[PDB]
Design a protein around this nucleic acid. Structure first.
Ligand SMILES: [Cl-]
Ligand SMILES: [Cl-]
Ligand SMILES: [Mg+2]
Ligand SMILES: [Mg+2]
Ligand SMILES: [Mg+2]
Ligand SMILES: [Mg+2]
Ligand SMILES: [Mg+2]
Ligand SMILES: [Mg+2]
Ligand SMILES: [Mg+2]
Ligand SMILES: [Mg+2]
Ligand SMILES: [Mg+2]
Ligand SMILES: [Mg+2]
Ligand SMILES: [Mg+2]
Ligand SMILES: [Mg+2]
Ligand SMILES: [Mg+2]
Ligand code: NA
Ligand code: NA
Ligand code: NA
Ligand code: NA
Ligand code: NA
Ligand code: NA
Ligand code: NA
Ligand code: NA
Ligand code: NA
Ligand code: NA
Ligand code: NA
Ligand SMILES: [Sr+2]
Ligand SMILES: [Sr+2]
Ligand SMILES: [Sr+2]
Ligand SMILES: [Sr+2]
Ligand SMILES: [Sr+2]
Ligand SMILES: [Sr+2]
Ligand SMILES: [Sr+2]
Ligand SMILES: [Sr+2]
Ligand SMILES: [Sr+2]
Ligand SMILES: [Sr+2]
Ligand SMILES: [Sr+2]
Ligand SMILES: [Sr+2]
Ligand SMILES: [Sr+2]
Ligand SMILES: [Sr+2]
Ligand SMILES: [Sr+2]
Ligand SMILES: [Sr+2]
Ligand SMILES: [Sr+2]
Ligand SMILES: [Sr+2]
Ligand SMILES: [Sr+2]
Ligand SMILES: [Sr+2]
Ligand SMILES: [Sr+2]
Ligand SMILES: [Sr+2]
Ligand SMILES: [Sr+2]
Ligand SMILES: [Sr+2]
Ligand SMILES: [Sr+2]
Ligand SMILES: [Sr+2]
Lengths: 143, 56, 81, 46, 82
RNA sequence: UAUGCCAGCUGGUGGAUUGCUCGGCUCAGGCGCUGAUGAAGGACGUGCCAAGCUGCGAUAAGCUGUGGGGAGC
RNA sequence: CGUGGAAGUCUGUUAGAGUUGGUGUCCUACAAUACCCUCUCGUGAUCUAUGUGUAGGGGUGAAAGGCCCAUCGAGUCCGGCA
RNA sequence: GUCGGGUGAGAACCCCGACGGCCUAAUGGAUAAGGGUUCCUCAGCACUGCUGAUCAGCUGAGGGUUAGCCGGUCCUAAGUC
RNA sequence: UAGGGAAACGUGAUUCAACCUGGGGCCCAUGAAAAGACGAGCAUGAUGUCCGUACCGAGAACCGACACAGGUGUCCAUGGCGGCGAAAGCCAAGGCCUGUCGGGAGCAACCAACGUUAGGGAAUUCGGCAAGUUAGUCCCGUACCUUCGGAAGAAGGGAUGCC
RNA sequence: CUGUCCCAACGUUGGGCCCGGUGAACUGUACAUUCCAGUGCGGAGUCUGGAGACACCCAGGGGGAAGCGAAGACCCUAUGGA
C-alpha cells in the first residue's frame, strides 16, 4: 500500500511540511481508498491524519546569558573575538557623543544659562573634541 | 578549466533550428541564414557540385 | 473552408465544469478567436455565451472553455448531442 | 525556454509518433516502431 | 518465559558508527541460542530497538536486561525490555 | 581416478553452404521541359480503431463526367 | 589631539575568480584533464549572464606560436582523389 | 539506518509508525537557458535502474497547461537584414 | 458584521532589508536610447482579440555518448545560538535517508585517509618534500633600513573562565 | 616544532579475505612443471647436456616471459612534408 500521494495531499490541505504529516498505522486501508482532496479532508476531521508541531530553538539559555552580559559580565578578554573597532564603531561612537553635547548646549542657550558668545566657544570646542563626554563638558562650564 | 568535458557545460545556446524552407535543423536563428538550403542568403537553393563525386 | 467547432472535449474535468460551473468544453480549430468560438457555439446550440477561455493543447488543437448564461444549462445541452 | 505556436504544433506531433504499432496491425500482417524516441536518450529538433 | 541479561560486548568488533545495528543482530542471535529456536522466529519489540539506539548509533549499551516468551506450533518468541 | 588431453555421439550456440529472388548493375530503343493560373521541395493535416509508408488536402487513402472494366470492394 | 575615509592598500574557504605544492588520490577513472589538503586574488588593468562584432594564410592574442566547439607552427567538412 | 507493521506469488532497499541520523547560500524556496510531456491517474515488469523491486524520470492507455491588468506582443541598444 | 483562524483574533519598544529622500568626495574614465506617461476632468455603458502557461531546473528531467563526483545564470545575504563576520560549530522552517547493492569474519598480510608514539630532534632528503609549530582579543613594547608611505602583527613580555 | 630519520609500535575508518546478487576488459602462433650450464643472429620454458619435477586449488608480493600498452619522438636514410 502506497500512501505517498496522500502524503503530498495531506501536506497541502493542512498547509504544513511533508515530513510533518502523521498517518494512523491502524487506518492504512482507509487512507488507501483516499483518492480525492475531500477524502483527505474528511480523514483529517476523523483524526486519522494529523500534523505534528514545529519545534523552536529554546531561547531559555540565551535569555539568561543576555541578562549577565547586559550587567557587564562574561565580556572578559577571553570571550572577545573581533577587534576593538569591530565591537564598537569609532565613527558611530562620535556621532553618539557629539550629538549628545550638541543636544546639551542647545538646551543651555534656550534656557538663558549660556549666551550667544559662550555657546559659540563651547560648540566649536565640542566639534574640536575637547570634551570627552557630556560630564567633561559640565566639568568645564562650572569654572 | 579543461577544454573537454567541463567546457561542455556552457552549452545551452540555440543556434541551428528547423528551417521554414527545407526543414532540416540548419536554420541559424542568430544569423537568420540556413546552412543546408541557404534560406536567408540566396533566392536560389544551396546545391554544390562537390556534394557528389566529380563524375557523378 | 474550415469549420470552427470540431468535436466536444468530454473528459472528467469537462464534467467538473459542466455540472459545477456551467461550462461547455470544445476542441476547436486553432485559427479561431475567442470571438469566433463564441458566435459559433451560439449559432449551433441556441445558447448565450458570456465568456470563452482558450488554450492551445499539446495535440496541436485548441481547447475552448465556453461559459453559458443562467438561462441556459450545460448539462441539458450535452444531452441531445 | 519559451516555445512558440508552431514549435508547439511540432513537439505535439513528435509525441504522437511515440505511440506503439496497434495490436491489430500484428494480427493483420500476421506478425516494430522505428521512430521510437525517449525523452533522455534521444534528441529532437530545434 | 524468563528474564535474560544479554551482553553486547561483541558489537565492539563491528565499526563504531554501526555499533547499534550489530547490537540488534547480537540480541536476536543470543535469544535464539538460549530459547532453542531460529533467528527468523525471534520477534523483538521496538523497546529493545529504542533501548539500543538511545545514545546514538555509536555509544550503544554494554548489557541489556530483556524479558522473553516461548510458544506456538512452529516455535517462536516475543521479546521486550524490562 | 579427480583437474584434464584427442576423436566422435545427441543436443545447443552460430549463420557459412546449397537452392530461391520483390533488388541491384549495364546496355539499347522511345521520350523530354516546369514555374507568379504560385513550380520543385517542405511542414502540418487526412482513416471507425491508424504508429510507419503510399495517397490525398479542411470536399483530405478521396468528389464529377465520358470510355474500359465487372462482381466484387 | 581629533574629524575625515583615501587605496591597481591590507586579513578574509563572504559571493566569486584563480590553481602553488603534495610530483598525494585516480590513471580499462566519477572524469578523453576528475578528487582532496594546501596555496593565491577577492573595490579593481576586478568577476559574471545574455545580446552582439572580428573567420582560416584570415580573427584574436598584457606574446605562450596562446585561442578560433576534445581539431591550431595555419580550424572543420566535402570535393580535387583511387 | 534499526524494530515493528502494511501490500504482495515474491520485499534489505515499495508504503505506515516509531527510534536513529544527514542537508542550513543548500540536499530548502522561486526561476532563466536548455529539455519536451519527463507533470497526474490507472495497469504492468520483456526493456532501462550499478543488487532486488510490488517502486520509478521505465512500459501501455487515459487526463492535465484556461489571463484586458504575468510574460510576449510595443520601444529603442551594440548591432543585423 | 471580506477573508483566514481550533483559539485568542495584543499593546508598546530597539536595531531596522526593502522602499523614500538628502549631504559629501573621485575622473588624462564624465557614466544609453527610444516608445510611452505627465502637462490636461468626470458619469454610464461597451470593448480588451492573438502567443506562452504542464513538469525538471540537476551528485537522475539541461551540456558532457551514462540516472557522469565534471560544467551551467539569476532572486531568497535578516530563521535561532554564535562570533567582527553572509566565518566555524550546533539547531529550526523545509528537504532527505537515492552522492542508491547487500551479508559475515576483533575483521590477517597489504593499500587509502588518519590518531597517539618514550629518548634524540633534520642525523632524513637534491631540498624540512610530508607533517608540524604559531594562532583570536587586550595591554606593554618594537630594531636595521626607508622613496618617509612603510618596515610592523617586526621581535620580545604579560593577560584571557565562572560567580 | 616535529615519526623526515635513528626504528619502528599500537589504534581508527573504507577496502582488502568468506557468502548472495550483478557482472566487464587488457591480452592469446602453438606447445608450455622448471632450474643450471652450453649453443644459437652474440640476451632460450621450447636447441644440446645434466639437474629437478605427482595433480589441482587459495592468498601474495611482482624476479622472468628482453611482460602488456605505442608501425621509436632519438639517429640515419627518402632526389619525403611543413
Ligand atoms: Cl512568462
Ligand atoms: Cl546632510
Ligand atoms: Mg502506482
Ligand atoms: Mg576614525
Ligand atoms: Mg491564453
Ligand atoms: Mg502520451
Ligand atoms: Mg612546505
Ligand atoms: Mg561575449
Ligand atoms: Mg616557441
Ligand atoms: Mg505544480
Ligand atoms: Mg544516480
Ligand atoms: Mg618521540
Ligand atoms: Mg645522507
Ligand atoms: Mg628531430
Ligand atoms: Mg621543405
Ligand atoms: Na532529450
Ligand atoms: Na519523357
Ligand atoms: Na508577374
Ligand atoms: Na497507419
Ligand atoms: Na589628519
Ligand atoms: Na591544485
Ligand atoms: Na588555412
Ligand atoms: Na536501494
Ligand atoms: Na545572528
Ligand atoms: Na605516524
Ligand atoms: Na613478476
Ligand atoms: Sr578543474
Ligand atoms: Sr552558457
Ligand atoms: Sr545575405
Ligand atoms: Sr549549385
Ligand atoms: Sr493528449
Ligand atoms: Sr542527453
Ligand atoms: Sr585590494
Ligand atoms: Sr586577501
Ligand atoms: Sr615538480
Ligand atoms: Sr591525469
Ligand atoms: Sr596530505
Ligand atoms: Sr571592504
Ligand atoms: Sr579524397
Ligand atoms: Sr520479475
Ligand atoms: Sr513522478
Ligand atoms: Sr536609520
Ligand atoms: Sr509552474
Ligand atoms: Sr529548482
Ligand atoms: Sr552542481
Ligand atoms: Sr527538520
Ligand atoms: Sr538501487
Ligand atoms: Sr592517551
Ligand atoms: Sr639538513
Ligand atoms: Sr644532510
Ligand atoms: Sr605573544
Ligand atoms: Sr595480486
Amino acid at each position: 500500500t502506497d500512501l505517498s500521494a496522500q502524503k503530498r495531499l495531506a501536506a497541502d490541505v493542512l498547509d504544513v511540511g511533508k515530513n510533518r504529516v502523521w498517518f494512523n498505522p491502524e487506518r492504512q486501508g482507509d487512507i488507501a481508498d483516499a483518492i480525492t482532496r475531500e477524502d483527505v479532508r474528511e480523514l483529517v476531521d476523523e483524526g486519522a491524519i494529523q500534523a505534528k508541531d514545529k519545534k523552536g530553538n529554546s531561547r531559555g539559555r540565551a535569555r539568561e546569558r543576555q541578562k549577565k552580559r547586559a550587567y557587564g559580565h562574561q565580556k572578559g578578554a577571553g570571550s572577545r573575538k573581533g577587534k576593538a573597532g569591530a565591537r564598537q564603531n569609532s565613527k558611530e561612537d562620535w556621532e553618539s557623543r557629539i550629538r549628545a553635547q550638541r543636544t546639551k548646549l542647545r538646551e543651555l542657550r534656550d534656557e538663558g544659562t549660556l549666551s550667544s558668545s559662550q555657546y559659540r566657544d563651547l560648540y566649536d570646542k565640542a566639534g574640536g573634541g575637547e570634551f570627552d563626554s557630556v560630564a567633561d563638558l559640565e566639568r568645564y562650564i562650572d569654572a | 578549466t579543461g577544454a573537454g568535458t567541463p567546457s561542455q557545460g556552457k552549452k545551452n545556446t540555440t543556434t541551428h533550428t528547423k528551417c521554414r524552407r527545407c526543414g532540416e535543423k540548419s536554420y541559424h536563428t542568430k544569423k537568420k541564414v540556413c546552412s543546408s538550403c541557404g534560406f536567408g542568403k540566396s533566392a536560389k537553393r544551396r546545391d554544390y557540385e562537390w556534394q557528389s563525386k566529380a563524375g557523378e | 473552408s474550415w469549420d470552427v467547432i470540431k468535436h466536444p472535449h468530454v473528459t472528467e474535468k469537462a464534467m467538473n465544469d459542466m455540472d459545477f460551473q456551467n461550462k461547455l468544453q470544445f476542441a476547436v480549430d486553432d485559427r479561431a478567436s475567442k470571438g469566433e468560438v463564441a458566435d459559433a457555439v451560439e449559432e449551433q446550440y441556441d445558447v448565450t455565451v458570456e465568456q470563452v477561455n482558450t488554450q492551445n493543447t499539446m495535440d496541436g488543437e485548441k481547447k475552448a472553455v465556453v461559459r453559458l448564461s443562467e438561462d441556459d444549462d450545460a448539462q441539458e445541452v450535452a444531452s441531445r448531442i | 525556454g519559451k516555445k512558440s505556436k508552431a514549435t508547439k504544433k511540432r513537439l505535439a506531433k513528435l509525441d504522437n509518433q511515440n505511440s506503439r504499432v496497434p495490436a491489430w496491425v500484428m494480427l493483420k500482417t500476421d506478425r516494430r516502431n522505428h521512430k521510437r524516441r525517449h525523452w533522455r536518450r534521444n534528441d529532437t529538433d530545434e | 518465559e524468563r528474564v535474560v541479561t544479554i551482553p553486547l560486548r561483541d558489537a565492539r568488533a563491528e565499526p563504531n558508527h554501526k555499533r547499534a545495528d550489530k547490537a540488534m543482530i547480537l540480541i536476536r542471535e543470543h535469544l535464539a541460542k538460549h530459547f532453542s529456536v531460529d533467528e527468523d522466529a525471534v520477534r523483538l519489540d521496538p523497546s529493545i530497538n529504542e533501548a539500543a539506539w538511545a545514545r546514538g548509533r555509536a555509544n550503544t549499551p554494554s548489557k541489556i536486561r530483556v524479558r522473553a516468551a516461548r510458544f506456538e506450533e512452529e516455535g517462536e518468541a516475543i521479546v521486550e525490555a524490562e
